[PDB]
Write a protein that binds this DNA or RNA. Structure first.
Ligand SMILES: O=P(O)(O)O[C@H]1[C@H](OP(=O)(O)O)[C@@H](OP(=O)(O)O)[C@H](OP(=O)(O)O)[C@@H](OP(=O)(O)O)[C@H]1OP(=O)(O)O
Ligand SMILES: O=P(O)(O)O[C@H]1[C@H](OP(=O)(O)O)[C@@H](OP(=O)(O)O)[C@H](OP(=O)(O)O)[C@@H](OP(=O)(O)O)[C@H]1OP(=O)(O)O
Ligand SMILES: [Zn+2]
Ligand SMILES: [Zn+2]
Lengths: 396, 397
RNA sequence: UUCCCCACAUUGACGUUCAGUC
RNA sequence: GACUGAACGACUAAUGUGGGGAA
């Protein structure tokens, strides 16, 4: 009973185990193609993640959208005030950023010519802005349970026998947790007071990054498109979360949504999303050797993968990633001009510095507050953000 | 890196920048060792180390380590003292300056203690009145990392967006005033539309605001390191040098220390915007991530051992007041004020014998303070935050 | 069930050494 | 120098199991 798939909604559109095994095969497969059958230099991974899109029930109408690896976060000294760094390179966190490029691309594809609109996954929304066509779903694959609430208790395979949580009501369950710089495990936020500072970090204060478990729970409320893309499009959710290993149904479902079911007063179109949760039929084996300092990423359409030094947030020659704040902002800005102002979901105008533009997404920003509040009232801690200095930059 | 190179001073150049830096860097750290049974003591665990070195002449070994201190945290708001027994700010460099104040009081006492001792005192009578420094004495500030606040806000693994010298095509003006956040080693900008702190208000739990060291040192580079009370006896003293053991970026530091308020006008006589020598050291400390110790060490030449203060409370572990608190400093000043004949005061002892009122006796210093506050507002850099006026109304014995 | 105490385990940095690539 | 791959040591602050308690 512990390691069994957890169905999603009220009308069931795919077979659970078939999908899980499908997306694990597809992503792990496409990761093979990118690495000349795992023989490549940067093919050594510790954790693998990816996003799969589906257009319909035919499980060969599936497309691998993104593939990524990584287990590390940026060093404190290497934070970039020009937004050129990858602050978090845990596999699944990167696949979401990889997904963002594909969404921007799809927006670009729509506003190119009327003949190309039919090829784009987006369409106009009666409410203003853009929405997905009625049959598009996205699915998250992680080769292992996400760090934090889904993985911290029992980081090892269940021994089945439905070895449910013998102590499900400890204060420590459902707690928000942060990756800590220069230390292992993931730690509660309560016991580590909040509000980070730029200079505080530069001095030696350990950089705190939210756990992947908490980040996805977040994706299950404000959606995966994030603030900037939410100005163009309506909130998008993962339909499924598939784990290639370390699956504990009870733990993952708490961490992914159950713990914030107290959330109220979400803005229109926003909701607490409860995706399909599942392990795969043949769980992945634990990967050999020391864990690599680099984090790989790819998005469908790309000619090559990108290899990032997780320590620094840049590549080997010190170049900014295609996934960093500064690039994503550039894509956003380029599309913002190609989109007519009667077609925006939010018409509030702000200067063109990063933090300020994110603030134009009032509803998304609102949803976030409902989310932070949910965790707090549940006694699960206050969310921890990067120093406010991190997002104060323009496009040169 | 053009970025990691010394910026010579607009003061007196008596030593070579780089020889001097490595000199005071090596001494303070050496003297911090001696105080801690060679770094083996419990209290040798620091995050930040600071110190003051004095020089008497051009020979670069005629130096004396005057003060040594450690600390990265501030008092908790709830724990402030209405009788001035608490140390509101225990940051390494802030603490070094207060210890230096003690060295200043001792040297004044030394002068008016014995006629023979006057030749041993760093002070001399001044023709303009009161006391002034001997014609070659300089003080040098060492900090093991760039001071918190504006001087530290930047990416140390990226080139500088050199401000295009032709009206920022967007908008700019960095250098904004920033405040230490209570229960943290860090800093946040000041609300450009803010409130003012109140005594009963903070004590309940409202944010205590203490200005960042970057903003404090800039203040030292205008009104001097001697503070208000001591300016009644002696003339303004400035650091000739500021040496950094890490996170040194010349253009950033020069900004935070003086360049951002170069718009300063109508300073009183003897007061000026001091532009000291800025420099890093050759073998920089590496960033050591981990907890910042909750305690603050301090020492002043003449002392037998160090004093250790709980930064959160501003007192020591047994709740005894530090030698650096307002009340202690007042005790030293009052001792001197009676030993000094009234024609020799730089301002007339007019006002009553409560702390705040005596600070107002320093008219030229107070004036200097106001021009400084005004420099920051007109520069579009935020308004300075002063503690509620209750902090400073208390008396002695 | 929850917490406490003690013991034993589990899970990103640092240092030492060894092997290679540009 | 940077990156890469194996060994050993020592840190990190949560978390697990057990024994004993407690509500
Ligand atoms: O995918 P991630 O690596 O976790 O990045 C996110 C993302 O920031 P960027 O897209 O700008 O990198 C969030 O932005 P949204 O698009 O979700 O709005 C931002 O959220 P805020 O808007 O709340 O700043 C959050 O940062 P924070 O730590 O401040 O929540 C930050 O995650 P990291 O900073 O942990 O990478
Ligand atoms: O070394 P610091 O901890 O920064 O102390 C200073 C110092 O006060 P004390 O010497 O009495 O401790 C200033 O005094 P002067 O420079 O005038 O001698 C004072 O400024 P004012 O006395 O002019 O108000 C200021 O306090 P404020 O917060 O009011 O600026 C205060 O700084 P802290 O309050 O951070 O100690
Ligand atoms: Zn993770
Ligand atoms: Zn400071």
């Amino acid at each position: 009973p512990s390691r069994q798939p957890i169905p999603s909604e009220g009308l069931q559109l795919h077979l659970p185990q078939v999908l899980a095994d499908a997306v694990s095969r597809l992503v792990l497969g496409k990761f093979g193609d990118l690495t000349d059958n795992f023989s490549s230099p940067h093919a050594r991974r510790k954790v693998l993640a990816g996003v799969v899109m589906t257009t319909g029930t035919d499980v060969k109408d599936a497309k691998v959208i993104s593939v990524s690896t990584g287990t590390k976060c940026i060093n404190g000294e290497y934070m970039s005030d020009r937004g050129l760094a990858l602050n978090d390179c845990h596999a699944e966190i990167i696949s979401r950023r990889s997904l963002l490029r594909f969404l921007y691309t799809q927006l670009e594809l729509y506003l190119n010519n009327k003949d190309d609109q039919k090829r784009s996954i987006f369409q106009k929304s009666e409410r203003g802005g853009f929405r997905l066509k009625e049959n598009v779903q996205f699915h998250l694959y992680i080769s292992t349970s996400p760090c934090g609430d889904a993985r911290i208790f029992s980081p090892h395979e269940p021994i089945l026998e439905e070895p449910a949580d013998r102590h499900p009501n400890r204060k420590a369950r459902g707690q928000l947790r942060t990756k800590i710089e220069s230390g292992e495990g993931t730690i509660p936020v309560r016991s580590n007071a909040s509000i980070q500072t730029w200079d505080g970090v530069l001095q030696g204060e350990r950089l705190l990054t939210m756990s992947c478990s908490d980040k996805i729970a977040r994706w299950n409320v404000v959606g995966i498109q994030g603030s900037l893309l939410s100005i163009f499009v309506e909130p998008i959710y993962f339909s499924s979360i598939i784990l290639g290993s370390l699956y504990h149904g009870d733990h993952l479902s708490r961490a992914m949504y159950q713990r914030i079911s107290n959330i109220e007063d979400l803005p229109p179109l926003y909701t607490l999303n409860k995706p399909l949760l599942s392990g795969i039929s043949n769980a992945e084996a634990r990967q050999p050797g020391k864990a690599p300092n680099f984090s790989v990423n790819w998005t469908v359409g790309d000619s090559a993968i990108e290899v990032i030094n997780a320590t620094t947030g840049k590549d080997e020659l010190g170049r900014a990633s295609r996934l960093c704040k500064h690039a994503l902002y550039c894509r956003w800005m380029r599309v913002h001009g190609k989109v007519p102002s009667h077609l925006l979901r939010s018409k509030i105008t702000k200067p063109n510095v990063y933090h300020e533009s994110k603030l134009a997404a009032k509803e998304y920003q609102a949803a976030k507050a409902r989310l932070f509040t949910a965790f707090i009232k549940a006694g699960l801690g206050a969310w921890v953000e990067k120093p406010t200095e991190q997002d104060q930059f323009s496009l040169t």
